[PDB]
Structure 1
Amino acid sequence: SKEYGVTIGESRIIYPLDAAGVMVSVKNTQDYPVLIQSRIYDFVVTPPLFRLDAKQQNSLRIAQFPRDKESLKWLCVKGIPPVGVFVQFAINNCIKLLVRPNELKGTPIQFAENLSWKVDKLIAENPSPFYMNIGELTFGGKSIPSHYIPPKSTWAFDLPAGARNVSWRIINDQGGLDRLYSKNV
């Protein structure tokens, strides 16, 4: 057997718009050295590539848009290790980088309950300025492969027998599950 692992010190970054920077720790939890390769997708990450030894942790700096709404990027952190079949893997651990204006006054959980639902697909409506990063979602007591709902917007889910109850939990800023909300549609 072969083992792989990359740990990022947080599961999301809330990045205050125009702030100087934030720090995130990365750990190589394995017994061999890796190169850590860090990227932002749709900001600088220093260092973008560096050697991280077995069992060691280091730190990355993330440094800087709409002013009414959050914006979303991804930080991805990859550990590159050093008929017969031989396969090598590398984990590329990606987390949400949520760019949040100071003007926005609150957090996502204050607006979690405001999600409204329609069928037309199961369509969620988000009147808040935040991404609603839903971590758990059901309809008719049936599980729906989940996704975030963008700020001031909607998102459409494929439907999974006449039942009309939607329940959801967003994922909060600390990466925890938020309270269960429930509504008839």
Structure 2
Amino acid sequence: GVALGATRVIYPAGQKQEQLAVTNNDENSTYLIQSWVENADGVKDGRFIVTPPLFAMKGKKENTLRILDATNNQLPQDRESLFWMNVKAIPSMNTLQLAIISRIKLYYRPAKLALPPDQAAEKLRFRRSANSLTLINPTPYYLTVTELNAGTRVLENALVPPMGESTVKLPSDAGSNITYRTINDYGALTPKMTGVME
């Protein structure tokens, strides 16, 4: 099998290139690894080049993917931008061929940000509508809200865009108390925070 080095890749602004580890643990296997970067909307974008785009991995061999930068400093410097790093592993074999695409997040993080990453998750606020819940995110970071419980019931994870809001379904009988967890840069759930309404 093939497994990526990290679940999310933080790209600092101005850095020439970033690396992502592609591992293979099966000795008797040949995998053609194809890679590309999509924009936030799932459309292929040529602003980030992943080299080598296509290469073959024989045996227990792991390579490093060099994510080159081609934006020419056009993304906003006051908020993060989200990109989707895609890695497809074609097995170099009436049969059905299965190719796995391990899509991960790729945050383009500008150098100068007011809020530190750790002190940004707790700044998320809440607003309870009649049958929907709105999450205000004044921090310039993308926030991944998981394990979102509104009372005794569990809601669906929402990815709140920076300086924006998202909406999730909210049952009418759910308790007023709201608690949430956020996934940090390392892919580990932060300690439980209480949800202060607005």
TM-score (norm 1): 0.90
Q: 1:184 Cα deviation (Å)?
A: 5.4
One-letter identity of the residue aligned with 1:36: I
2:13 aligned with 1:17: yes
Structure 1 residue 106: Cα displacement: 4.0
Aligned ranges for residues 1-185 of structure 1 at < 5 Å?
Answer: 5-30=1-26, 31-42=28-39, 43-64=48-69, 65-82=75-92, 86-120=95-129, 121-160=132-171, 161-183=173-195, 185=197
Q: Give the number of equivalent residue pairs.
A: 179
Q: Which runs of 5+ in 1 are unaligned?
A: none
Q: Counterparts of 2:182 and 2:174 in 1: how far apart (Å)? A: 25
Cα distance in 2 for partners of 1:103, 1:184 equals 28
Q: Unpaired segments of 5 or more residues in structure 2?
A: 40-47, 70-74
Structure 1 residue ranges (4+ consecutive) displaced by more than 4 angstroms after TM superposition: none
- Residue identity in the other structure for 2:105: K
Contact 1:108 1:132 in 2 (8 A): no
Q: Is this contact kept in 2: 1:15–1:98, CA < 8 A?
A: yes
Identical pairs, percent: 38
Whether the 8 Å CA contact 1:6–1:93 is kept in 2: the answer is: no
Q: What is the RMSD of the two structures over their aligned residues, measured on CA atoms?
A: 1.6
Is the 2:152–2:174 contact (alpha carbons within 8 Å) kept by the matching residues of 1? no
Deviation at 1:19, TM superposition (A): 1.0
For the residues of structure 2 that align with 1:106 and 1:174, how far apart are their CA atoms? 18
Q: Deviations over 1:127-151 (max 9, x none)?
A: 0000012232111222222121110
Q: Distance in 2 between matches of 1:35 and 1:109?
A: 38
Question: For residues 96 and 149 of structure 2, what CA distance do their matches in structure 1 show?
Answer: 38
